[PDB]
Structures are given as C-alpha cells and as structure tokens.
Amino acid sequence: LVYRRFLFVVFTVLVLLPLPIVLHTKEAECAYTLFVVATFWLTEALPLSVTALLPSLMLPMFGIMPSKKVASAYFKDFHLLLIGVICLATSIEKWNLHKRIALKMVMMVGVNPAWLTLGFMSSTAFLSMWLSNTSTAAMVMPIAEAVVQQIINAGHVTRKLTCLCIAYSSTIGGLTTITGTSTNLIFAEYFNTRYPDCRCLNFGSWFTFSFPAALIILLLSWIWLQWLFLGQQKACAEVIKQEYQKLGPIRYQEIVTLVLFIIMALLWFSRDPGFVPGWSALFSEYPGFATDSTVALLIGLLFFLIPAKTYSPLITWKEFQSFMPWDIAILVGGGFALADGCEESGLSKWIGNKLSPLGSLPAWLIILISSLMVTSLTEVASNPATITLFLPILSPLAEAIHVNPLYILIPSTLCTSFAFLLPVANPPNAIVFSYGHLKVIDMVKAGLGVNIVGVAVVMLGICTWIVPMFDLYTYPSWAPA
Amino acid sequence: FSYILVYRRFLFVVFTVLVLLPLPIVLHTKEAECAYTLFVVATFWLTEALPLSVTALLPSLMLPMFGIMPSKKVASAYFKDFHLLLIGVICLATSIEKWNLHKRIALKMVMMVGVNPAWLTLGFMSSTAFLSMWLSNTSTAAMVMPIAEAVVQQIINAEAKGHVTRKLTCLCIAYSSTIGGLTTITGTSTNLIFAEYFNTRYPDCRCLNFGSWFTFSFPAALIILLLSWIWLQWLFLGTVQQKACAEVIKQEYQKLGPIRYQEIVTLVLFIIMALLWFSRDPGFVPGWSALFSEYPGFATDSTVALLIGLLFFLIPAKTLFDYSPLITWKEFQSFMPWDIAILVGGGFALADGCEESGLSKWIGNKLSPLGSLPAWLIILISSLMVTSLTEVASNPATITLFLPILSPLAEAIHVNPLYILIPSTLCTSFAFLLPVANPPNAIVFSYGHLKVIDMVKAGLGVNIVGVAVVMLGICTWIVPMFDLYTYPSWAPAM
C-alpha cells in the first residue's frame, strides 16, 4: 500500500524491464538510451538536468563514444551567446531598466480596456526578441500585476486576461530571432553541423521570414483573447504617472545599459546576407571564425569593467551566476551529446531508411503531421526536450525522400514553441501560474484557439513567402543521397 | 589626482591592452598574436584586475578575432573529462555537508589526534601523498579537502591567525596530491604517457615498470615533501587554555547524537567510489578495465564519479505525500562552483590555442640548437623550460610536445636517452603557481580561502625545491640504477 509514496523510485527502474539490448549489436544500444531519456523527460521523474548527464554515463559504457568525446558536446557555441545575453539581462534587471521601457509603452497608448492589453502584449513581445522568454516573463509579469493592482484602486476577468497575455506574448516574441529562445538556438546549432557547405541560415535570413509570421500572430491573437473575455479614467491615467514620477530621471547605469543594448543589436544585423556586404568581409581570410557569439561576448564582458558606483562594476560575478540558468546549459549539452551519439552509432540511418515508405504522400502533409504531433506533444513536456528528441529523427526523413531539410525542420522548430495550454512543464505559464489566478480550463480554451492560428499562419507562410526565399522546391547539392 | 587611484583597475586593463598592440600588428605571424593573447590573459589574473572567470572568457573572444581557431572549436575546449568528474564528485560533497558527515569524521579526528598546528599539517600531507600514489591527483584532492577544511574549522571554532591557517590546508593538500603522484607510474598521467612513448620508441629495453619507478622517485618525493612542509609552514605561521579547548570538542561531538540513516548511505557511497577508482587499472593487477578491453580507454574515472554521484538524486531521504531525495538538485546548483568550470576551461582553451597557432613548437624547437653544451646544462635548461611551460598548459600536453624534441636531441650528443627524459618528466608535474595549470590547484581554490599571489609566492619555493632535488637525484643514486653514464645498446648507434 506504500507504492504511491516512493512512486518515481519504482518507476525510475525501467533500466530493467525494457532491456532487450543483450540480443542486438550497436544500434539498439543507442536506442536504449534514447527511450530511457525520453521516458525521464516526458514524465519528469528526475530533476530534468540529471537525465542530461545520463548520455555521458552509458555511451562510454556501451562502447559508442569515448568519455572525452561526449564531454566535448556539453559546451557548444550556444553557450557563449547564452553567457553574453545574460550578462546584459542581469544589468537590465538590476538597474530597473525593464520597468522604464514597460511603463513607457503604457501611458503612450491609452488606458482603454482594449488598448491596455495590446501594449501589455507588445512590451514583452519586444523585450523577448533579444533575451530569453524565461527571463522576460520574470520581468514583465511583476510589473503588470502591480499596474492592475493600481487600476482597481482608482475585476477577475481583466486580471486573468492580463495574466495570460504576458505568458502568450512571451512565447510569441520567443521567435523572430534565433537568440529569442533556446529552441531556435539549438536548432541553428544542429543546423551548423550535419550540413557543412550549406550557407543559407544566419541572423539576417532568420528575421526575414519570421517577423511577418509572428506579427500577424500578435494581431490575430489579441482579437481572440479580447473576444473570449471582454465583449472616470483620468485618475487611472494618473496612477501610472504615480510610478513614472516615483522613479526619478534616467540614470548613468541605465543610459550605458541601453547604449550597450542598441550597439549589441546593431551588430548581428551587419554581418549581413547578400543584400549588403557587412563587417564579416573585413575578416575575409577566415569566413566562419567570428560567429554571432563573439558579438555577445564583446559587449557582455564590458559590464564587468565599466564603473557604476564606488569602484564597483555594472554587474559583479556573484550576481551574475545567481542569475544564469545552469540547468539549461547542462540540459542542452545533454541533448547535444545524445544527438551526436545517434550519429556515431548508425541509428539515424536506420530511421532514415525505415521511413522511406512515408515519402509516397504529398510533401505538405508530411510537414503538417510532423508539426501537428510536435505541437500535441510539447504541451506536456519541456520545450528544449521535444525539439531535442525529434531533430535527429526528422532530419534523416528529409534526406531519404528527396525533400529539402529546411522544408521540414523550419515548421517543426516553430510549432514546438507553441506551448499555450498545460502548465506542467511550461515556463511563461509557469511564472504566471505562481499567482492565485488563471485556472486550468480557461488557459486551455484560450490556448487551443491561438494554437490553431499559430499553425495556420506557419502553414500559409511556408507556401507563400519562404519557398521563393530558401529555394525549398529545388532540393540542393548539399545533403546528398 | 585621486581619480587615477580609485579607477586604477579600469585604466590598467585598457593600458595593458593598448600598450602591447604593436606586437600582433607589426609581427603578423600567428605566434605573435597567440603570445599577445597569452601575455594579456596571464597578466589579468597575476595582477587580479578582473574576476578570474571573466579573464578566462577572453580566449573565447580574441582567438577567433585573430584567425587562430574558429568559435566552434574554441567553445569545444571549455568542457573536458575533468568537468564530468567535477560534476560527479561534488554531488558527494553537497551531500556530506547537508547531513553533517563532516563534523563527525572531523570531530573524531580532532579528539583522537589533538589541536596542534605544526603536526596536523604534516598528517594532512603524509596522508594525501600516500593516497595519491594509488588514485588520481584530482580524485585525491577532491576527497581529503572537505574533511580537512571541516577539521580546521572545528579547531578554529573551539576558541571560546584563523585566516592564515586556512591557506595552509589548501596549499599543503593541493601540493601533496601532486608530489605523491610522482612515486608510481599509474599515479599520474604524465608518467603513463612517458612510459608508453619510451617503450614504443626504444624496444629491447625492459626497464620501466612498477618497482623500478618506485626506487628512484620515492626517495626524491620524500625529500620534496619534507622540505615543502617546512617551507609552507614557515611562510605562513613560522594548559589551562589548552584543556578547555578539548572539552568544547567533546561537548560538541556529544550533541550530534547517534549517526542517522542519511549519513550511513553517503559514507557507504564514499567508500564505494574510492574502491571503484582504485580498482580500475592499478597496473600490477588487472582491474575492471579488462571487462571493457575491446573499447579501451572509453570508461574513465569521470564515469565512476557520475555513476555514483547521480545516485544521490534517486535514493530517498525524508517522506513528505511524496518522498524527498538526498540532494534535491537546488542545493546542488548553489553548492557547485560554476566559476571554476569557466576558469579551467579558459585555461584549456589557451593551451589549445598555443598548439593550433604554433607558439609551443616555436618554444620547443629552440632547444634543438643547444647540442654543443655540457650534458648537465642542457638538462637544467630543458627542466626549467618544462617547469615554465607547464604553468600555462596542462601536464599531458607538455610532455607530449617535449618528448619528440628531447628524445632525438639525446641521441645526437651521444647521451643515454633516459638522462634527459627522466628529469624532464618529473619537472612537468611541478605546476604550483597558478590554479589553471593543475586541476588539484583548482579544487582548493573552490573554497575562497586563497588569493593567487599566495599561490604564486608559496609555489615559487616548492618549484625551486623540486628542481633542486631532481637535479640532485639525476647525479646520485639514479646514475648506478639505469646506468645513465654509458651509451646503451637499445639506443641507435649513429
């Protein structure tokens, strides 16, 4: 009768019951670690960064990769950019610059009940474009829970609509940049490998197809969240001025931070694609040496040096490592170690030639079902796990049926970020679920209607303006047969 | 005038960056740019102008900007097999502090040995160096240190001088774990690389084995240990009150109570990890590596650390209507030093940059035109160059570079090719100044008791003692052993 107490002790031993690997050679040994980590990632029977250290344990014990080969995959070029942007987000949050450019988009728009939760949507949609959406949901949500605390002192539907609009617009602003969330970053890191002579994916070629795709989302989702819930005021227009004059003039530590933000954003836009010759032609002797991560490290290391107050820098190391997520680094490294182990074992050739019967359907239905299943699966598991487990599976599916790899991997890396419904493994509707509002069914009913319009504009996006961009009907010389 | 004095570590960084800028732009070669990258970074911790994990991120910034190695390759040097061992062995260290396993081993050691400062820093050195001749150096320094820090903290807390006695126990463990690894072949990774290179370069020799390495390296290491103890203990701190400090320890040990369930499991796993570390490949007996002798060198000591360190996240500790594990992982993220993983990775990246650019070959091949010298002087030049080069690169990378440079040099000048290779292998392990050169030097740097000037000032004397004892041994008691004065028959005649 005591089995329900120690519940994920007796469940975590499925090291024993699926063990049909003493019968097969090498690829079932790699498809044993793939099932175990997926079972521990879906149900979350472990702290979710402990399972990422499991490919560093049994892949040397099976004889697939050496232990110094697995350890090299735990720190890729994503981690330098992750250090560089969290060096900026520490100084944005510490010197209260996020409150400066969130109470400014409100009071510029009106305080009407239709336009207030459009400025609330567009503040975090511009904040999450550069930082991570887990960071920007932790900054905007404490502000707007205090603004509506004031607007009722000058009911329940308005506060819950504001609670879900931030958590939706944070994941809406998670795309339009590779650096906006971890999903597009690990997709770009997986795309730099496995397709070496392909030169089509950069920061300029990412903003072009994704900024029309997620601004129509923001304007078609606000109508859906307004229709579902909502259909004297000079004092409430003054109660926002109550805080914007409580904060004094703009300080030196905020001018330096926004200047270093604008300078960091003007780079990544001037190592351009074919439109403009950029500063990457200054280093013409070495084409792929200085990446987007060396820009983040050049700017983010200036926060440890520039004086702020008596000296003491803008940020210190003790308040930096108290801000950086050291779980996401280990989790992404463990995903890359398992993705690199399915290649050195021959599993992602067996999945590629066992799914060649699937290339008899039309090519749009394949990406439709591979986006629908990754959208239905990501509502219960973590988002850097659902796209982790599927990218070494969908990629040999493209190379075997003569379909472009960006034809399949692009609508599958954006639809996996459409996590609007169950708050069991989601950040932004995790942070917003820490308050005592926003019941479960009211999130699901507002989330499936925005998931429909999220999938529909991606399905009309890849059929109108991306097929003349990445040449997705004319399967290239790279990734051969 | 005081504005120059208060902002002195802002003007110093931007002064020493711009004053050395003619060196990579007048000299356009990659050795000059890598020497600029080395001299700028190594000055930034020796003066300690920036935090040490911020200066370690500078190889990830200017090595792609000079054109030495791409960002995808310089990012793959910030995580090696040391980091899996560091992740695994700290899960044990997180759990022995939470359930107070230390202050039960510590308070029992204190009230069975006594409060004596000079004779406690000899028992900490003679036990670390005896444990390090069977285990790894990094594996030894990670186990003795959380117990010894608790021992001296319980000795300090029984006062009812303390800051300077905390650097002693860091340095005398981080140095003894290194000195004790010279006595055996398998005790460190420099001796194994040298023994596998010497046997494939010079067959028909049959000389280097267990017992033959012990009878020239243990009397050398014992004198280095006995003199480093006197040097370190003089450098820092050269019975009515006493028996009252023996009652505080007794009354603090009795208020622990009986040993609980959560201490027994971590005590058992501490023994199991040290038993699996010893029996992997002890050399004289085949270990459990023979079970995997079709994938050789695949499972290292980091696999053993991970396999037992991830068992703390699973084993139940307290009921709730769930259970609770032993470590809960949020107590792990606060306990784990994340500044040391970047400091060791930035040191690995510099060592890879000096190999990719060609500065290490440039330094090594300037030893070739020194053939027209007496034989004891080329030994002293090569051993000094090796001790200088091991302070910025790792020890398995320095001996790998310097063996194919010193081994043909010894055969051209009609010298036995063990008279040159033995003192250059033992001097490769003498990494004592910086915490980026030796991985045991970074374990004791994870506790915050030291500056790096205290490391440099104390490891400068141990380096001189170690070079002098090696040069004493290369002329006495080793000369009759390996016959280092006649040109042998397993060496080529021409």
UniProtKB/Swiss-Prot annotation, chain B:
Keyword Membrane: yes
Tissue occurrence: Highly expressed in kidney; not detectable in the other tissues tested.
A single MF term (Gene Ontology): monoatomic anion:sodium symporter activity
BP-aspect Gene Ontology terms: sodium ion transport; sulfate transmembrane transport
Residue spans crossing the bilayer: 10-30, 38-58, 74-94, 105-125, 128-148, 168-188, 219-238, 264-284, 297-317, 369-389, 396-416, 417-437, 459-479
Top-rank taxon: Eukaryota
Alphabetical UniProt keywords: Cell membrane, Glycoprotein, Ion transport, Membrane, Sodium, Sodium transport, Sulfate transport, Symport, Transmembrane, Transmembrane helix, Transport
Membrane-protein topology: Multi-pass membrane protein
Pfam family, one: Na_sulph_symp
Protein name per Swiss-Prot or TrEMBL: Solute carrier family 13 member 1
Organism: Homo sapiens (Human)
Upper classification of the organism: Eukaryota, Metazoa, Chordata, Craniata, Vertebrata
